[PDB]
Amino acid sequence: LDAVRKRPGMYIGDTDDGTGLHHMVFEVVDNAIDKEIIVTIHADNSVSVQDDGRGIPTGIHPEEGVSAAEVIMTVLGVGVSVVNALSQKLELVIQREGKIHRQIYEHGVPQAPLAVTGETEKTGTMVRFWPSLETFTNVTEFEYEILAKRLRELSFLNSGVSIRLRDKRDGKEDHFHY
Ligand SMILES: Nc1cc(-c2ccccc2)[nH]n1
Ligand SMILES: Nc1nc2ccccc2[nH]1
């Protein structure tokens, strides 16, 4: 990830006008799109993307020797590893094979291995990220309508996916489904 950290604008887009900032969300959503996705803008200016999919794989990657999810998050669509690298904090929650798994990153650095924290009957993946204010300048707050515009376009192209957008700062919400 040091290549990304070294030139963030080249991977995520302009880090001063809000372009790159919002592309962080779009990258995560893109990965989720591969049946309901919920994008939430939190009051602390983090965004979370949840789905009810199968959950990303949690087993150890036989080559890298860490969880497959960690490989996805830390090894170079630009890839969610870019989002992770440029987030001061990122929380990953995977519900899969009857288990809830959690992991925290800071600036792309895992704080511990992906760990089983409980049981569940649901499946899905949740990523919540806090963009690094060391990288993103000037425009540092998410603009609802920038997200809504893109998610609407995506909903038309991905006919079987329901997309919800929620703003916890002011209660605004939308539901894109084609
Ligand atoms: N909310 C999410 C994030 C992801 C995801 C899937 C593949 C790679 C990275 C992230 N799925 N659902
Ligand atoms: N604040 C801060 N920024 C960082 C960038 C890379 C690794 C660790 C870091 N801690």
Side-chain angles (χ1 to χ4, degrees), residues 1-62 64-171 173-178:
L1 298 175
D2 264 347
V4 177
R5 300 193 184 94
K6 188 174 174 180
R7 295 284 277 152
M10 298 301 302
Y11 294 82
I12 202 68
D14 192 305
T15 63
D16 199 69
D17 68 3
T19 303
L21 182 72
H22 294 85
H23 180 37
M24 297 274 283
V25 182
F26 305 148
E27 196 61 34
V28 180
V29 170
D30 273 359
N31 284 265
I33 282 161
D34 319 340
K35 283 215 186 68
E36 181 158 277
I37 292 165
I38 305 173
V39 184
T40 306
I41 306 168
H42 296 266
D44 65 355
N45 206 53
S46 61
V47 169
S48 66
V49 185
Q50 326 165 221
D51 70 45
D52 58 355
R54 299 180 307 288
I56 68 191
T58 61
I60 299 300
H61 194 282
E64 301 292 339
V66 300
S67 78
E70 182 171 324
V71 177
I72 290 167
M73 299 301 314
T74 63
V75 177
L76 259 169
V78 87
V80 298
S81 64
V82 170
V83 174
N84 192 202
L86 308 178
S87 292
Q88 56 192 48
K89 181 156 91 128
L90 180 148
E91 173 184 22
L92 173 60
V93 188
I94 300 161
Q95 296 179 88
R96 185 171 167 103
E97 288 182 63
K99 307 316 182 143
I100 308 168
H101 312 73
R102 295 189 177 259
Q103 196 182 21
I104 301 299
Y105 295 80
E106 293 180 8
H107 294 283
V109 179
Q111 300 305 105
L114 184 71
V116 171
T117 56
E119 290 187 314
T120 180
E121 307 287 16
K122 297 180 270 126
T123 58
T125 303
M126 194 280 289
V127 172
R128 187 167 167 178
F129 68 94
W130 289 254
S132 177
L133 297 172
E134 292 166 11
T135 292
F136 300 98
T137 55
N138 181 34
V139 185
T140 62
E141 291 162 344
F142 293 96
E143 178 160 28
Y144 185 90
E145 196 37 58
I146 295 179
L147 300 186
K149 179 163 168 215
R150 181 71 69 101
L151 295 174
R152 176 164 171 280
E153 303 272 343
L154 279 172
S155 73
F156 279 87
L157 189 62
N158 301 99
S159 300
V161 187
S162 175
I163 302 171
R164 298 197 177 260
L165 178 61
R166 300 174 171 164
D167 198 329
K168 298 185 76 161
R169 302 165 302 185
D170 68 359
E173 62 178 297
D174 277 287
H175 183 200
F176 306 109
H177 62 287
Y178 185 66

